[PDB]
């Protein structure tokens, strides 16, 4: 698998980065040239001692550290891969997280963000007072006056959030949002990280629930990822204990 | 800007990778910890001489070569950045490429791919024979029988391509596609890389043309990119001439 030489120096399949032999014959040609071009650049960079310069050396230290770190993390991940994830862990996860992660569904809604539960509560009562026909415009009006969402505030768009997938918004905000009938709004504020939301649902399409079997690949990945993060965290917290760490602010 | 120390060793803003001071005070906290965690991993990796191992060393050579190469390319790019792109080059580009790159427009269409111009021509005549009402189903039928698009062939979906943006399909295929009235198909084949297409337009929304002024940032970028590629190509072709290059297939 010496694919080419440049000034004698072999180009080989090891010159590539994540399958070469599965590539179309003409794709291969294109890659060999890229690697030829790389090698010509490298030779030139070395002749010019771009690598001995301080700019590069400094930068190379960062790169090497990052590399060494990812290397170490890769190794953590490999201990995880050897562990079988039990079928049971996977169905449990599917059941618990189905509605949150395994439902394709799109909504258009608008929201109002406020700082306190009572402000949110006040906003809901105001809208509650309005005849059905008036509720949407009242929501829009209050959003423009009272929302603290900067973009919403700046846009004066009635707190329009545009269309979003169920799995792509914060979970408890999505649950609330998608739980509504179109044309209704939440009668109870929704606390998040940012404050309290009132959500008005404009529209939503019909949800499609992925089955266990369709979900299972993604589930497997997510559980390994969690095992991996747990593993690394555990190890890093042990390292943390043997070091003297001082923050300056 | 010593943000923290780990066992005496400073963590500094140089530990980060493309602005730290623009970051929210709590974002900063989170980053300092990431870098603390990085440093703990690095220390451990070094104690374990993960860096002296052959696995790593081999991998580090690739990384260093790539780095040295990108470094050299960055430098090429910087000679380009010092050059002012004339207003004239930019309007010319805008005018020439407007319809192709600066029009937001979505279409739903289906196509048939065949190997030769005469096969494509045959398909068009067949459809031409059909009463208006029958043309779509005839197109679908022929696509299923005759298309050579593997996915289309495998799916038997009447060569349905789904919905696509004007700027996100091959240009001459988009021009043809978007030039159609809905419910019409191309009376002339469209040669591309893959063969000859017959395109049937199902639907399209209304196009929005970005103005020069809206386009100009992207235009500037695209022209620098071209200058950059030209520059690098030119330099690399000079290097190519001084080397002995042999491919083995």
What are the structural domain ranges in chain B?
Answer: 1-48, 53-96+211-249, 103-209
Among A54, A72, A238, the strongest candidate for a mutation testing the B interface, having the largest count of B CBs within 10 A, is A72
Q: DSSP readout, B58-118?
A: HHHHHHHHHHHHHHHHHHHHHHHHTSPPPHHHHHHHHHHHHHHHSEE-EEEEEEEEESSHH
* A240 Cβ neighbours under 8 A, 6+ residues apart: B36, B37, B40
What is the rounded distance in angstroms from the CA atom of residue A235 to the CA atom of residue A228? 11
What architecture is the B103-209 domain classified under in CATH? Roll (3.10)
Chain A: give the shortest CA distance to residue B134, in Å: 32
Of B213, B227, B189, B195, give the one whose Cα is nearest residue B79. B227
DSSP-derived secondary structure for B6-39:
ETTEEEEGGG----GGGS-HHHHHHHHHHHHHHH
CA-CA distances (angstroms) from residue B192 to A95, B113, B142, B198?
Answer: 48, 10, 20, 11
Residue whose structure tokens are 């990431």? B34
Encode chain A in three state secondary structure.
CEEEEECCEEEEHHHCCCCHHHCCHHHHHHHHHHHHHHHHHHHHHHHCCCCCCHHHHHHHHHHHHHHHHHHHHHHHHHHHHCCCCCHHHHHHHHHHHHHHHCEECEEEEEEEEECCHHHHHHHHHHHHCCCHHHHHHHHHHHHHHHCCCHHHHHHCCCCEEEEEEHHHCCHHHHHHHHCCCCCCECCCCEEECCEEEEEEEEEECCCEECCHHHHHHHHHHHHHHHHHHHHHHHHHHHHHHCCCEEECC
B194–chain A nearest CA distance, Å: 14
Token reading at B117: 């111009």
Taking one residue from A and the other from B, the number of pairs with CB-CB distance under 8 angstroms is 138
**Closest residue in chain B to residue A51, using alpha carbons only:** B68
User: What CA–CA distance (Å, rounded) separates A185 from A118?
Assistant: 16
Cα angle B80-B85-B91, degrees, rounded to a multiple of 5: 145
Q: Do B111 and B198 touch, CB atoms closer than 8 A?
A: yes
Name the minimum distance, in Å, from the CA of B5 to any CA of chain A: 5
Helix H or strand E segment including B209: strand B208-209
- Contact across the interface for B44 and A239, Cβ inside 8 Å: yes
Bridge partners of residue A6, in order along the sequence: A9, B245
User: What CATH architecture applies to the domain A1-50?
Assistant: Orthogonal Bundle (1.10)
Give the experimental resolution in Å: 2.1
Rounded to 5 degrees, what are φ and ψ at B152? -60, -45
Q: Give how far A6 is from chain B: nearest CA, Å.
A: 5
Contact B236 A37 (CB under 8 A): yes
| Per-residue tokens: A152 | 């919403």
Q: Indicate the DSSP class of residue B51.
A: T
Kind of pairing between the strands at A106-114 and B190-192: unpaired
Residues recorded for chain B: 249
Nearest CA to A245 out of B42, B37, B4 is that of B4
B interface test, pick of A24, A68, A232 with most B CB neighbours within 10 Å: A68
Cβ atoms within 10 Å, residue A248? 11
Method: X-ray
Which of A7, A44, A248 is the closest to B72 by Cβ?
A44
The answer to whether residues B105 and B99 touch, using CB atoms and an 8 Å cutoff, is no
DSSP B194: T
């Amino acid at each position: 698998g010496v694919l080419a030489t440049v000034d004698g120096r072999p180009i080989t399949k090891s010159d590539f980065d994540m399958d070469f032999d599965k590539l179309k014959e003409k794709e291969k040609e294109t890659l060999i040239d890229q690697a030829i071009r790389t090698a010509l650049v490298e030779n030139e960079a070395k002749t010019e001692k771009l690598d001995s310069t301080p700019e590069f050396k400094a930068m190379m230290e960062a790169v090497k550290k990052q590399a060494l770190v990812e290397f170490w993390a890769k190794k953590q991940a490999e201990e995880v891969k050897k562990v079988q994830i039990p079928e049971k862990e996977m169905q449990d996860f599917y059941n618990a997280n189905k509605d949150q992660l395994f439902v394709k569904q799109e909504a258009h809604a608008r929201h109002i963000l406020v700082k306190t539960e009572d402000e949110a509560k006040r906003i809901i009562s105001e809208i509650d007072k309005q005849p059905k026909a008036k509720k949407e415009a009242k929501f829009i009006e209050l959003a423009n006056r009272d929302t603290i969402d900067p973009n919403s505030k700046n846009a004066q768009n009635g707190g329009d959030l545009g269309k979003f997938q169920k799995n792509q918004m914060a979970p408890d905000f999505s649950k609330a949002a998608f739980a509504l009938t179109p044309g209704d709004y939440t009668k109870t504020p929704v606390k998040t990280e940012f404050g309290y939301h009132i959500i008005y649902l404009i529209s939503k399409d019909s949800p499609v629930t992925y089955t266990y079997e369709q979900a299972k690949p993604t589930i497997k990945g997510m559980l390994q990822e969690k095992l991996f993060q747990e593993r690394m965290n555990q190890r890093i917290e042990e390292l943390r204990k043997h070091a003297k760490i001082v923050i300056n602010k």
